[PDB]
Amino acid sequence: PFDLKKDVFVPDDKQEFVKAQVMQQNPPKFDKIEDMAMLTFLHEPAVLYNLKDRYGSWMIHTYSGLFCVTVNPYKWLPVYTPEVVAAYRGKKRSEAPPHIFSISDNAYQYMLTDRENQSILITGESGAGKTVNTKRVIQYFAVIAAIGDGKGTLEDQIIQANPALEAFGNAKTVRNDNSSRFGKFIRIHFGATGKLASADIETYLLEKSRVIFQLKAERDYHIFYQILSNKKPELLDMLLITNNPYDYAFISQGETTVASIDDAEELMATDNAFDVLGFTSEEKNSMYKLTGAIMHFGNMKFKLKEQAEPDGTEEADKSAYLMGLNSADLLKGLCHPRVKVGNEYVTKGQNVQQVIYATGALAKAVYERMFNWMVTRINATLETKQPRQYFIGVLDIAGFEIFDFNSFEQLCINFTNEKLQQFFNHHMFVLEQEEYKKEGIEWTFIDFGMDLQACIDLIEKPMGIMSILEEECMFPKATDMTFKAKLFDNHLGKSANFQKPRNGKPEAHFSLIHYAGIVDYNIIGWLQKNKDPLNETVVGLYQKSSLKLLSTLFANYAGADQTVSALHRENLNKLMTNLRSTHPHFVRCIIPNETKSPGVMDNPLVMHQLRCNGVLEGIRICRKGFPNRILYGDFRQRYRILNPAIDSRKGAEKLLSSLDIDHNQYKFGHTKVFFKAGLLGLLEEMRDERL
Ligand SMILES: Nc1ncnc2c1ncn2[C@@H]1O[C@H](COP(=O)(O)OP(=O)(O)O)[C@@H](O)[C@H]1O
Ligand code: VO4
Ligand SMILES: [Mg+2]
């Protein structure tokens, strides 16, 4: 039943809103609507209850005008079958239920239609569902390619690239058991005619610190635990290691086992991927050897000879062989590093703290450089040298996160999420309205309040958090307190998004009002994390190493004779300019609850996400504007059938007036007919009714 004026939504204190500041409920005709732009009433609880209702029937995808919202089901669903893949092909958005397969197919459709590169941009916080959705886009394209009209086919290698990468670059955190600890942009290349030709991956900022450090409730990278599972006892013999994670300090500061992850079957999936990817046994064992060496490296003790000297060579010995190095040379490089004196050298001295730091850095450097090499190797086999014309890029970044302890790592992560949200804002609100102005459409610019420019400027612009951190690095006398002091002198009271920390729970130094909330940051060791300096004496031995992998990992290295933040900003800007030259397809992932409960929806958490993403705003610009527009030529070429009674424009004017449609549903532009929501669908439907 229904009551047009009595059925309303009231602001609940614990559940955001509740079925009954009074908003009208939508009629039952619109229950579980596939496109929320077609709801008669549009307010916060209207969108919240349509999403909650669809999620109750396990319908995790839902359209919001031109973009899609997916809510993590936390449970496998039978909607990603190859049968469903084949059915989604060729289908228009309006003639199939919302799905990630529809976003992918329609990006493909626009690519060949417009002769334009596309990009599937997936947003969301930690554990929202970004990586799963990214894998389903690649899965759709590979399955579609593999059906047409040792090392495996291009399609299998593309799929198997991700399990190989997740072992080395993904890890369990407090918010996600398989959190991506690096950004990823994947391009799927096609020829002029649409046949899949090639693929490449570009990875961004792997969280180095995780390799040698873990928080109370989190693990190191999956790979360590997979190896220590003993599902391949041969690997333990090869790496000269025990079967206990608690025997290795670098990998056991936090948790060591995850309930949702079977580390034994995962190592099998990991190894199988390297096989399909074309890797060799020497290649696999070299990466396994290096992973092992990094564990032994962390177990080396030191002592006062203020100068350090090895406290027992047992752990040093094991890692030196796995690396193809001399154990005495390795230890003398750590404790007594060479300093250039023209064509000669003098060693400097180090204390136990200085050697411990140097060792930590070297393991992080080896690990990150191993991941880079691995990505390059995957790229080398994905390179088919077949003719390519276009590409469909997929962006899977590390999601917005807030831990009990937030450091440099969290700042770089959250910065990117703020940057990508601004991409959505600029595309959906600024560029869209400039297109109406361009085509002489009657329109007055709307301010949707979607502009995190102040927060982005605070982080990246000169004298901002990152610019201050870069300048303070290039001062040898600079300390964490001088950086803290510089941040506050320039920004306290001046930058609105920079606040004093809101402190049991670890001590924070400053607050940052991000698009998705206030994040408390601890600036300890940020100067060192940004510098990333290495013991060049040990790096020198690495260059000469008898293990080809370790030698090539460090062959391209520049000595003493650039920072993390400068490189991150450089890559982020390069990425945003390159995405600007594509047709973007936004997928907004929503985490339904903190506790990983499938089918359960926390209303205050979902509504927070929908607000900071701009879902209501993005729906309104679709309703108030004109989301569909066809060139007068492309309109006569397809819709002349409707009424065949010389100019492309004048003919379209007479055609639309001769039809039984609302004459307010369309507007005439300089080169295109701009349609209101749903009118295009009705015109396409009418084309079948006389085809
Ligand atoms: N569509 C989905 N179907 C089933 N489970 C999902 C889906 N998307 C995500 N999950 C679950 O949620 C976890 C976290 O999602 P993930 O894609 O890794 O998040 P993010 O990359 O945004 O941090 C996954 O490991 C998986 O267990
Ligand atoms: O958990 V994430 O993969 O979004 O970092
Ligand atoms: Mg991820």
Side-chain angles (χ1 to χ4, degrees):
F2 204 66
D3 202 310
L4 186 57
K5 288 196 177 183
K6 285 180 176 294
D7 289 17
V8 290
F9 283 114
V10 282
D12 199 74
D13 315 292
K14 285 184 195 168
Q15 221 50 26
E16 284 285 351
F17 303 95
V18 59
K19 274 205 227 67
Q21 300 247 299
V22 190
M23 297 139 292
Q24 277 292 158
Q25 285 195 25
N26 266 293
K29 193 164 90 169
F30 308 92
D31 285 3
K32 296 179 288 191
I33 204 160
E34 301 184 345
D35 195 345
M36 294 185 283
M38 307 306 185
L39 294 172
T40 26
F41 301 100
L42 202 85
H43 34 68
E44 297 200 342
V47 173
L48 164 70
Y49 276 63
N50 194 81
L51 286 175
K52 193 174 169 66
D53 273 349
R54 283 186 59 91
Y55 189 67
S57 320
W58 297 109
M59 306 158 171
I60 67 173
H61 314 84
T62 305
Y63 293 141
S64 298
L66 291 175
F67 58 97
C68 174
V69 174
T70 89
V71 180
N72 195 346
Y74 272 118
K75 161 201 196 169
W76 178 95
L77 296 173
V79 303
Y80 305 104
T81 86
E83 295 75 34
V84 181
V85 178
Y88 265 98
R89 202 211 308 108
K91 295 269 194 318
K92 258 57 197 172
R93 199 175 176 262
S94 52
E95 57 207 24
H99 207 292
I100 185 64
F101 295 172
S102 217
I103 302 292
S104 322
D105 180 74
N106 285 269
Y108 184 84
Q109 280 185 58
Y110 283 126
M111 175 191 70
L112 301 177
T113 290
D114 304 328
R115 303 136 297 168
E116 191 169 320
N117 297 321
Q118 316 279 309
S119 72
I120 300 140
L121 307 173
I122 309 150
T123 64
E125 51 183 64
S126 190
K130 299 187 291 296
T131 299
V132 174
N133 278 260
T134 295
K135 295 190 296 198
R136 313 321 301 202
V137 167
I138 271 96
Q139 196 240 321
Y140 172 86
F141 287 133
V143 166
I144 281 297
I147 76 174
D149 297 88
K151 181 202 237 280
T153 72
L154 174 71
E155 301 87 24
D156 314 305
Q157 304 194 54
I158 288 171
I159 293 170
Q160 294 297 312
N162 309 289
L165 291 172
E166 284 178 18
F168 285 92
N170 281 47
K172 188 255 183 189
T173 74
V174 45
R175 242 293 184 95
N176 184 355
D177 293 327
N178 191 52
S179 185
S180 314
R181 315 305 304 165
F182 72 106
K184 174 178 67 274
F185 189 60
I186 295 168
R187 296 190 302 177
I188 287 164
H189 300 275
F190 297 91
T193 61
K195 313 290 151 273
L196 180 75
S198 264
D200 63 61
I201 308 173
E202 178 171 6
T203 57
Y204 300 103
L205 218 61
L206 175 63
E207 194 180 32
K208 277 155 94 102
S209 89
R210 188 166 297 264
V211 177
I212 67 174
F213 171 81
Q214 299 88 56
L215 297 167
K216 337 93 194 198
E218 65 181 23
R219 287 217 315 195
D220 204 317
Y221 290 101
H222 299 323
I223 187 68
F224 296 105
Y225 308 99
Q226 311 200 341
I227 290 175
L228 304 179
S229 83
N230 198 63
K231 195 64 188 290
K232 280 220 170 206
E234 54 262 30
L235 299 179
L236 276 81
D237 276 320
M238 168 147 283
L239 321 186
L240 181 51
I241 46 170
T242 80
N243 61 352
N244 187 354
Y246 289 109
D247 273 317
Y248 308 104
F250 266 3
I251 64 120
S252 64
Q253 298 146 65
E255 297 172 5
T256 54
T257 41
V258 180
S260 76
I261 306 168
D262 184 310
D263 289 317
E265 299 326 301
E266 291 308 331
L267 174 63
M268 308 293 259
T270 285
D271 198 83
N272 180 75
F274 284 125
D275 289 350
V276 171
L277 286 163
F279 288 59
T280 72
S281 304
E282 192 65 26
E283 281 167 333
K284 305 162 208 165
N285 282 0
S286 291
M287 305 172 73
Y288 280 141
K289 262 177 263 233
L290 287 181
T291 302
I294 286 165
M295 313 176 82
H296 291 308
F297 230 68
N299 275 4
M300 306 182 309
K301 295 165 174 139
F302 286 89
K303 57 169 183 195
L304 306 176
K305 198 152 160 281
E306 266 287 314
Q307 160 85 68
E309 64 146 291
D311 176 70
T313 66
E314 319 65 25
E315 302 292 317
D317 272 27
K318 315 199 178 67
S319 69
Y321 193 48
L322 294 161
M323 285 166 127
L325 303 177
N326 181 275
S327 182
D329 288 332
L330 176 55
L331 297 175
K332 283 294 121 199
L334 290 176
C335 310
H336 308 280
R338 303 154 74 136
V339 160
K340 210 198 220 320
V341 197
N343 292 334
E344 286 180 300
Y345 65 92
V346 175
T347 73
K348 72 180 277 200
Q350 303 276 286
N351 40 61
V352 184
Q353 296 98 47
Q354 285 189 294
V355 185
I356 291 299
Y357 188 77
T359 298
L362 289 158
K364 292 198 291 206
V366 163
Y367 196 83
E368 184 254 340
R369 297 173 89 110
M370 187 178 47
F371 188 83
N372 277 331
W373 169 88
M374 177 184 70
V375 166
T376 307
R377 261 301 271 99
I378 303 169
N379 279 338
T381 63
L382 291 188
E383 163 210 88
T384 70
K385 300 172 169 311
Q386 303 285 303
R388 54 182 168 106
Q389 178 136 336
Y390 324 100
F391 81 83
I392 299 171
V394 201
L395 186 67
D396 183 34
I397 59 163
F400 186 86
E401 69 189 31
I402 304 173
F403 294 167
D404 284 358
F405 182 67
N406 300 300
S407 190
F408 194 51
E409 285 82 4
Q410 283 68 77
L411 177 70
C412 305
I413 287 168
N414 298 348
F415 168 53
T416 304
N417 282 256
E418 190 105 26
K419 260 283 192 142
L420 178 58
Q421 172 61 51
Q422 193 59 16
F423 190 95
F424 178 90
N425 292 343
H426 178 78
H427 185 83
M428 300 276 116
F429 310 111
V430 172
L431 293 184
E432 178 75 350
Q433 298 194 77
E434 292 177 344
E435 177 64 30
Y436 303 162
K437 239 141 205 193
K438 188 188 91 183
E439 298 275 332
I441 288 290
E442 183 155 44
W443 180 260
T444 303
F445 194 94
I446 307 174
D447 189 340
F448 290 90
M450 299 308 305
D451 196 9
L452 341 150
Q453 204 47 61
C455 188
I456 296 167
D457 279 4
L458 171 59
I459 304 171
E460 64 173 27
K461 290 293 145 47
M463 285 300 100
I465 297 170
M466 281 171 192
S467 178
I468 289 180
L469 184 62
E470 282 166 25
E471 158 224 73
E472 281 267 315
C473 279
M474 309 317 186
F475 290 142
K477 290 219 297 186
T479 71
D480 296 329
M481 316 316 159
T482 64
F483 174 56
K484 215 277 277 157
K486 274 225 167 82
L487 287 181
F488 273 83
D489 289 334
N490 288 260
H491 301 273
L492 189 67
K494 316 196 179 61
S495 309
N497 297 75
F498 180 94
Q499 294 299 318
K500 297 179 208 176
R502 339 160 283 165
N503 306 268
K505 200 166 161 278
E507 194 214 349
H509 304 114
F510 78 92
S511 272
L512 223 51
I513 312 171
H514 284 282
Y515 81 102
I518 296 94
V519 187
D520 301 279
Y521 296 104
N522 175 279
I523 49 59
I524 292 302
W526 280 27
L527 295 163
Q528 301 178 59
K529 284 184 192 218
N530 211 30
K531 285 172 191 206
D532 195 3
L534 289 185
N535 193 299
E536 305 214 318
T537 303
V538 173
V539 166
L541 310 181
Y542 285 170
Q543 292 197 322
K544 298 162 100 163
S545 184
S546 73
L547 165 62
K548 222 206 156 197
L549 185 61
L550 181 55
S551 77
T552 71
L553 291 194
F554 287 85
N556 295 341
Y557 188 85
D561 68 70
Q562 220 205 7
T563 48
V564 163
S565 56
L567 191 54
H568 186 53
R569 291 184 299 100
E570 188 176 277
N571 278 346
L572 217 61
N573 290 328
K574 227 258 165 305
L575 175 70
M576 298 294 163
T577 79
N578 282 299
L579 292 171
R580 230 171 282 136
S581 294
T582 59
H583 176 172
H585 299 265
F586 301 106
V587 189
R588 326 303 310 276
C589 296
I590 303 296
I591 190 166
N593 67 74
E594 296 289 331
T595 64
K596 316 190 184 46
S597 307
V600 168
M601 183 166 289
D602 187 294
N603 287 14
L605 182 75
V606 162
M607 201 70 250
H608 168 83
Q609 289 169 95
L610 296 181
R611 285 182 190 122
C612 81
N613 284 197
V615 181
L616 262 72
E617 286 96 329
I619 294 179
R620 293 201 176 94
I621 184 77
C622 163
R623 293 154 61 104
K624 316 306 167 201
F626 303 94
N628 291 101
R629 51 266 203 173
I630 305 177
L631 293 133
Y632 295 112
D634 295 1
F635 181 78
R636 87 196 301 208
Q637 164 258 299
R638 197 164 195 88
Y639 307 90
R640 210 196 174 262
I641 182 78
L642 318 166
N643 185 32
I646 313 297
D647 188 25
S648 306
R649 159 130 195 194
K650 294 239 282 187
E653 289 183 324
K654 302 172 183 76
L655 172 70
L656 299 166
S657 200
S658 73
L659 305 173
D660 195 56
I661 44 188
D662 184 14
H663 307 326
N664 292 298
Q665 285 275 107
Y666 64 92
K667 247 200 195 291
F668 289 118
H670 287 148
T671 60
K672 293 190 255 189
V673 195
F674 279 70
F675 307 118
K676 281 274 185 183
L679 172 64
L680 181 62
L682 173 62
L683 303 186
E684 261 302 323
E685 270 186 332
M686 284 184 186
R687 200 221 192 197
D688 289 340
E689 301 165 8
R690 211 62 192 165
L691 207 54

